[PDB]
C-alpha cells in the first residue's frame, strides 16, 4: 500500500506491465518513434523493479499519475513535436494530467496500416517475436488513443495465437488471412462501440444512459434484486463517465473496483459469473462484460398485477417517478432477454407517457388499464422486419441479399454517394450473416448490437458531408427512434434521374482477373448507378438486366479472346438494356 507502481507490477506481472506501459505511452505520444517508446518502457520497468525490492526507495511513494506525467515531461522533443502539449509540463497535478487529456488527439493524421504479405509477416514473427508484436501494438495504440488499454492487450494476444498456429501451417494464407480479417472486424467493432457509448452519454444525458443500463443489466442478471441492479447501474454510470473522459488510470481503477464487488456478491447477482471471477486481475471486468445471460427465475408474477391491476400505481409513481419507471424496466427486461434494449426503452417510454396522462385523470385505474395493448405493435414491428429479412437472406445468400439491400436503399436515398451505399449495404449484409444463424430468441439483441454501430458510423459520415434532410432527421432523433426512423424512409419520388454516362456502363476484361471480393464491388457499383439512372425500374425489369449482365460476363471470360467480346457484346448489352427501360 506504500508503493503503487510496485503493487500494479506484482498484480500484473512483468510481461503484462511492459505491454500496458507501451500502450499508455503510444496513446499520449502518438508521434514519437517506436525506439523512443521502448526506451521509456524499459526505464519505467527498471524503476518499478527498484520499488518491488524496496518499497521505501526514492519516488516509490509517488502516485501513478505523477510518475507518468514526470516521464512524459522528460521527452526533450516535446515542444518541437507536440507544441502546446509541452506547456502542460509547467502545471502541477491534477491540472497537468487534465492538460494532457485535452491534447490527446483522436483520429490523428497517420497513414493507414498496410497488411504485408503472409510470408513476410511469418518470417518477421519467427525471427523476432517481440519487436514484431510490440511494433504493431505501438502502431495500433497510437491510432486508437481511446481504446481501453487492457482490451487492446486482449486483442494482441489473439493476434499472437493466430501467428503461432498459422505460420507453422501447410497453407499459411488459408489459415492466417481469414483469422486476421475476423480480428480486424472485431477490433473495429469494439472501437466503434466504445465511441458510440461515450457519444450517447454526451448527446442524451445521464438519465437515458441509466435507463439503457438498467434494461441491459436486468436481462443479464435476472435473479438479482432491483436494489442490487440499481447499485450496479450507479457504479457503471460513474465508470463510463470516467472511462470516456480518457484517463486510463482512473478508468482501470474504477473497473477493478466494480469487478471485485460483483465477484464478492456473485451469489446475489448471477450463477454464471464463476469462470470470470477466478481469472486474473487484468481479465476480470472484460470477462464480466461478456458473460452470458443467467437463466430467469421460474416462478415470476405477471407484470400486470404490480403495473396495471394495482390500485396504488399513480401513488407509487408520483412518490419517485424514475424509480418506479426503473422498476418497470427491470421487471420487463429480466423477463425478456429476447428483446433489444432499445425496444424495452420504447416500452418504458410508452408506459411513462400514459402514466403522465392517466394519473391526472378523474379515474386513473380505468385510463391506464389497457396500456399493455399499445405494447403489441411495438414488439411485433422489429420481430417482423427480422423474420422477413432473414427469410430473404436464406433464399439468396449473402451476396445477392446484399444486392437486394442496395436496390432498396438506393431508391430510398439516391442522393447518397455510390461508394457509401455499397459499403453500408455490404455491412448490412454481414449483419444478416451473423444474426440470422441464431434462433429467434437471440436474433433481436444480435441485430441491435450490429445495427447501432452501422447506423452511428453512417450518421457521422452524413454529418461531415450532408446530403438529405431525411437522413439528418433520423440521425438527430432520440436514440430510441433512430432505427424506426430509418425503417420508415419512403421511396424518393422527388428524385430526378442521373444522366446516362457510357463510361459507367463500359466493362473491360480486367474483371475476370480480379478477386471475388473486388469483382463483387465492381458489379455492385454498377448496380447502384443503374438504379440512379432508372429509379422507376421494377424488381422484375432490374432482374432481367442483372441476368443478361451475368451472362454477358460469363460469355466474355470463358472462351477464346476477351477484349473484343467485352467491347462487342457490351455495346449490345447497353443498347438492349436501354430500350427495355424507356
Ligand atoms: C509510471 C506509471 C506507469 C504505469 C502505467 C499504467 C498501467 C497500470 C494500469 C493497469 C491496471 C489495469 C487493471 C485491469 C482492471 C480491469 O479492467 O478490470
Ligand atoms: C499486435 C500484433 C498485430 C500483428 C498483425 C499484423 C497485421 C495488422 C494489419 C491490420 C490489418 O490486418 O488490416
Ligand atoms: C434506478 C433509476 C434508473 C433511471 C431509469 C429511468 C427510467 C426512464 C425510462 C423511460 C425511457 C427513457 C428512454 C431514454 C431515451 C429517451 O428518452 O428517448
Ligand atoms: C467501460 C465499462 C464495461 C464495464 C465492465 C463492468 C462489468 C459489469 C457490467 C456487465 C454488464 C454489461 C455492460 C456492457 C453493456 C453491453 O453489453 O453492451
Ligand atoms: C438481421 C437482418 C439484417 C438486415 C438489415 C435489415 C434490418 C431490419 C431489422 C431491424 C431490427 C432492429 C432491432 C433493434 C430495434 O429494436 O430497433
Ligand atoms: C452519408 C450517409 C448516407 C445516408 C444513409 C443511406 C443508407 C440508408 C441505410 C438505411 C439503413 C437502415 C436500417 C433499417 C433497416 C430497415 O428497415 O430497412
Ligand atoms: C441503361 C442500362 C445500362 C445497362 C448496363 C448493365 C448494368 C448491369 C450491372 C448490374 C450487375 C449485377 C450483377 C449480378 C450478379 O453478380 O449476378
Amino acid at each position: 500500500h506504500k508503493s503503487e507502481v510496485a503493487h500494479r507490477f506484482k498484480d500484473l506481472g512483468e510481461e503484462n506491465f511492459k505491454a500496458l506501459v507501451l500502450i499508455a505511452f503510444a496513446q499520449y505520444l502518438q508521434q514519437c518513434p517506436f525506439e523512443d517508446h521502448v526506451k521509456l518502457v524499459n526505464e519505467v520497468t527498471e524503476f518499478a523493479k527498484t520499488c518491488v525490492a524496496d518499497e521505501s526507495a526514492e519516488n516509490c511513494d509517488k502516485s501513478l499519475h505523477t510518475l507518468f506525467g514526470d516521464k512524459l515531461c522528460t521527452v526533450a522533443t516535446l515542444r518541437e513535436t507536440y507544441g502546446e502539449m509541452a506547456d502542460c509540463c509547467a502545471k502541477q497535478e491534477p491540472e497537468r494530467n487534465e492538460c494532457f487529456l485535452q491534447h490527446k488527439d483522436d483520429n490523428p493524421n497517420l497513414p493507414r496500416l498496410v497488411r504485408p504479405e503472409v510470408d513476410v509477416m511469418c518470417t518477421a514473427f519467427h525471427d523476432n517475436e517481440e519487436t514484431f508484436l510490440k511494433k504493431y501494438l505501438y502502431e495500433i495504440a497510437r491510432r486508437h488513443p481511446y481504446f481501453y488499454a487492457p482490451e487492446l492487450l486482449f486483442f494482441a494476444k489473439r493476434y499472437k495465437a493466430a501467428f503461432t498456429e498459422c505460420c507453422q501451417a501447410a497453407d499459411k494464407a488459408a489459415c492466417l488471412l481469414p483469422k486476421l480479417d475476423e480480428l480486424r472486424d472485431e477490433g473495429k467493432a469494439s472501437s466503434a462501440k466504445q465511441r458510440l457509448k461515450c457519444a450517447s452519454l454526451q448527446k442524451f444525458g445521464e438519465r437515458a444512459f441509466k435507463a439503457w443500463a438498467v434494461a441491459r443489466l436486468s436481462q443479464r442478471f435476472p435473479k438479482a434484486e432491483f436494489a442490487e441492479v440499481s447499485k450496479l447501474v450507479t457504479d457503471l454510470t460513474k465508470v463510463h463517465t470516467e472511462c470516456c473522459h480518457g484517463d486510463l488510470l482512473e478508468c482501470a481503477d474504477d473497473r477493478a473496483d466494480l469487478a471485485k464487488y460483483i465477484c464478492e456478491n456473485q451469489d446475489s447477482i448471477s450463477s454464471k459469473l464463476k469462470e470470470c471471477c477466478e481469472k486474473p486481475l487484468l481479465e476480470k471486468s472484460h470477462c464480466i462484460a461478456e458473460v452470458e445471460n443467467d437463466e430467469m427465475p421460474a416462478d415470476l408474477p405477471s407484470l400486470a398485477a404490480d403495473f396495471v391491476e394495482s390500485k396504488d400505481v399513480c401513488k407509487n409513481y408520483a412518490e419517485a417517478k424514475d424509480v418506479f419507471l426503473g422498476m418497470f424496466l427491470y421487471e420487463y427486461a429480466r423477463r425478456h432477454p429476447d428483446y433489444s434494449v432499445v425496444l424495452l426503452l420504447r416500452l418504458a417510454k410508452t408506459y411513462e407517457t400514459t402514466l403522465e396522462k392517466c394519473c391526472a385523470a378523474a379515474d386513473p385505474h380505468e385510463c391506464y388499464a389497457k396500456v399493455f395493448d399499445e405494447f403489441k405493435p411495438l414488439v411485433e414491428e422489429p420481430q417482423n422486419l427480422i423474420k422477413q429479412n432473414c427469410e430473404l437472406f436464406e433464399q439468396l445468400g449473402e451476396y445477392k441479399f446484399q444486392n437486394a439491400l442496395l436496390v432498396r436503399y438506393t431508391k430510398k436515398v439516391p442522393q447518397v454517394s455510390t461508394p457509401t451505399l455499397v459499403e453500408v449495404s455490404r455491412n448490412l449484409g454481414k449483419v444478416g450473416s451473423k444474426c440470422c444463424k441464431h434462433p429467434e430468441a437471440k436474433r433481436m439483441p444480435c441485430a441491435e448490437d450490429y445495427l447501432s454501430v452501422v447506423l452511428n458510423q453512417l450518421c457521422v459520415l452524413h454529418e461531415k458531408t450532408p446530403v438529405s434532410d431525411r437522413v439528418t432527421k433520423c440521425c438527430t432523433e432520440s436514440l430510441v427512434n433512430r432505427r424506426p426512423c430509418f425503417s420508415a424512409l419512403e421511396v424518393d419520388e422527388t428524385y430526378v434521374p442521373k444522366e446516362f454516362n457510357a463510361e459507367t456502363f463500359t466493362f473491360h476484361a480486367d474483371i475476370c482477373t480480379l478477386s471475388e471480393k473486388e469483382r463483387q464491388i465492381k458489379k455492385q457499383t454498377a448496380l447502384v448507378e443503374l438504379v440512379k439512372h432508372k429509379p422507376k425500374a421494377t424488381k422484375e425489369q432490374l432482374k432481367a438486366v442483372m441476368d443478361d449482365f451475368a451472362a454477358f460476363v460469363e460469355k466474355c471470360c470463358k472462351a477464346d479472346d476477351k477484349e473484343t467480346c467485352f467491347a462487342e457484346e457490351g455495346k449490345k448489352l447497353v443498347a438492349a438494356s436501354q430500350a427495355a427501360l424507356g
Side-chain angles (χ1 to χ4, degrees), residues 113-116 121 132-133 136-137 140 156 159 163 180 184:
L113 275 169
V114 285
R115 184 182 286 174
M121 286 182 287
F132 183 77
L133 301 163
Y136 273 108
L137 193 53
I140 307 272
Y159 273 97
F163 284 92
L180 286 176
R184 171 181 55 77

Side-chain angles (χ1 to χ4, degrees), residues 399 403 500 505 523 526 530 533 545-546 549-550 573 577-578:
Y399 171 67
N403 295 344
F500 177 91
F505 298 99
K523 287 145 93 210
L530 171 53
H533 175 50
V545 173
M546 286 184 286
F549 178 85
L573 181 76
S577 289
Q578 273 196 70

Side-chain angles (χ1 to χ4, degrees), residues 197-452:
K197 279 173 176 182
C198 302
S200 307
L201 224 192
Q202 192 166 343
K203 285 182 301 145
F204 301 108
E206 194 171 81
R207 200 188 174 244
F209 186 84
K210 293 181 166 210
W212 189 88
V214 166
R216 183 63 156 204
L217 280 180
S218 305
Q219 286 183 318
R220 192 150 298 189
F221 304 142
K223 258 95 104 310
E225 279 167 29
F226 175 73
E228 201 59 46
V229 173
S230 198
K231 202 257 177 181
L232 298 169
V233 163
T234 306
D235 282 18
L236 231 216
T237 301
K238 171 72 188 136
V239 168
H240 278 271
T241 292
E242 211 61 47
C243 294
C244 287
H245 189 233
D247 190 324
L248 167 66
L249 297 172
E250 288 282 316
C251 173
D253 273 345
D254 290 340
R255 275 190 166 234
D257 292 341
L258 184 52
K260 190 197 151 175
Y261 180 85
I262 282 154
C263 287
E264 279 173 39
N265 294 244
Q266 217 180 132
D267 312 312
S268 166
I269 305 169
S270 171
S271 71
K272 302 215 164 177
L273 236 13
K274 210 181 289 186
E275 177 162 36
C276 296
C277 280
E278 296 164 344
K279 301 225 162 210
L281 201 112
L282 199 62
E283 306 185 301
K284 278 212 199 88
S285 67
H286 171 79
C287 189
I288 301 171
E290 293 271 319
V291 82
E292 166 142 73
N293 300 340
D294 201 6
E295 230 157 298
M296 31 187 287
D299 59 353
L300 280 187
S302 184
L303 284 160
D306 277 301
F307 301 100
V308 177
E309 299 176 339
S310 204
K311 70 146 93 216
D312 304 323
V313 158
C314 296
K315 181 188 187 295
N316 285 171
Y317 170 68
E319 172 178 284
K321 290 183 182 182
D322 288 354
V323 178
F324 188 72
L325 291 171
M327 220 168 314
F328 175 89
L329 258 172
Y330 156 83
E331 289 295 4
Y332 219 117
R334 69 171 162 154
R335 278 172 181 83
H336 289 281
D338 62 316
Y339 288 8
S340 60
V341 181
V342 281
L343 168 63
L344 292 158
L345 288 179
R346 295 181 205 117
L347 299 178
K349 180 69 155 90
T350 299
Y351 187 64
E352 178 183 42
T353 303
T354 77
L355 285 196
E356 284 290 304
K357 186 149 88 280
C358 293
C359 291
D363 195 359
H365 195 297
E366 267 60 32
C367 178
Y368 64 66
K370 293 317 290 187
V371 68
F372 278 41
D373 301 331
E374 275 148 33
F375 296 165
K376 258 187 58 156
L378 267 11
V379 168
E380 284 185 51
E381 133 71 6
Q383 275 170 4
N384 286 351
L385 285 186
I386 290 173
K387 204 104 134 39
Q388 177 185 136
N389 282 268
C390 289
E391 283 184 38
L392 195 48
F393 165 89
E394 227 66 31
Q395 301 171 163
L396 304 173
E398 189 178 324
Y399 171 67
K400 295 208 257 252
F401 180 60
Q402 282 169 339
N403 295 344
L405 301 188
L406 228 28
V407 175
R408 186 157 91 203
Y409 301 124
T410 302
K411 289 192 164 175
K412 284 185 188 214
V413 195
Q415 315 75 5
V416 174
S417 125
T418 289
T420 299
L421 292 155
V422 169
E423 193 175 287
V424 315
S425 309
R426 293 188 94 247
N427 286 339
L428 253 23
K430 287 185 209 188
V431 180
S433 269
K434 197 69 197 203
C435 298
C436 297
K437 296 283 165 50
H438 298 312
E440 214 199 311
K442 288 290 212 289
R443 288 184 173 173
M444 219 197 302
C446 183
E448 168 179 60
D449 228 67
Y450 285 89
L451 225 52
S452 70

Side-chain angles (χ1 to χ4, degrees), residues 3 30 119 182 199 240 295 321 397 515:
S3 183
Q30 311 153 4
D119 292 328
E182 196 181 300
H240 278 271
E295 230 157 298
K321 290 183 182 182
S515 58

Side-chain angles (χ1 to χ4, degrees), residues 125-198:
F125 178 75
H126 170 281
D127 270 31
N128 206 338
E129 206 170 348
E130 259 276 294
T131 70
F132 183 77
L133 301 163
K134 292 299 178 67
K135 169 85 163 152
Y136 273 108
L137 193 53
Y138 152 79
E139 299 292 2
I140 307 272
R142 72 209 281 245
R143 283 159 179 89
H144 293 81
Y146 285 92
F147 202 111
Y148 184 57
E151 211 200 324
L152 198 37
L153 190 48
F154 299 143
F155 278 96
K157 299 182 211 270
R158 287 160 83 198
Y159 273 97
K160 179 172 182 160
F163 284 92
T164 296
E165 190 181 335
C166 295
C167 292
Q168 280 172 344
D171 201 356
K172 299 199 217 313
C175 189
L176 191 49
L177 288 185
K179 228 157 272 207
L180 286 176
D181 278 335
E182 196 181 300
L183 258 48
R184 171 181 55 77
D185 287 345
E186 275 172 42
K188 290 219 293 276
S190 174
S191 184
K193 281 154 79 169
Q194 286 173 68
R195 284 183 289 261
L196 171 75
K197 279 173 176 182
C198 302

